[PDB]
C-alpha cells in the first residue's frame, strides 16, 4: 500500500466548508408524496419483499 493525505500538503491548502441547505417541499410535491405513500400502503410498500 501507499497512502497520503492533505495534512502533509496542509498549511497552504485553502479551507473547505460544508453547508447544509433545507428546502421545504412544494404543495404539489407534498400532495404527490402523500399520494405515493398511500399507494405503496395499498402496495404494502414492498418493504419486506
Residues at the contact surface with another protein, assessed by CB under 8 A? 1-6, 8-9
The full length of the chain comes to: 49
In terms of CB distance, is 5 or 47 closer to another protein? Answer: 5
In terms of CB distance, is 11 or 28 closer to another protein? Answer: 11
Instruction: In whole angstroms, give the CA distance from residue 13 to residue 23.
Output: 31
- The DSSP secondary-structure symbol of 40 reads H
CA–CA–CA angle 25, 30, 41 (5° rounding) = 135
In terms of CB distance, is 16 or 24 closer to another protein? Answer: 16
Q: Minimum CB separation from another protein for residue 13, in Å?
A: 9
Amino acid at each position: 500500500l501507499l497512502r497520503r493525505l492533505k495534512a502533509d500538503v496542509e498549511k497552504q491548502m485553502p479551507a473547505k466548508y460544508e453547508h447544509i441547505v433545507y428546502c421545504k417541499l412544494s404543495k404539489r410535491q407534498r400532495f404527490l408524496y402523500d399520494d405515493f405513500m398511500s399507494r405503496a400502503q395499498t402496495k404494502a410498500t414492498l418493504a419486506s419483499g
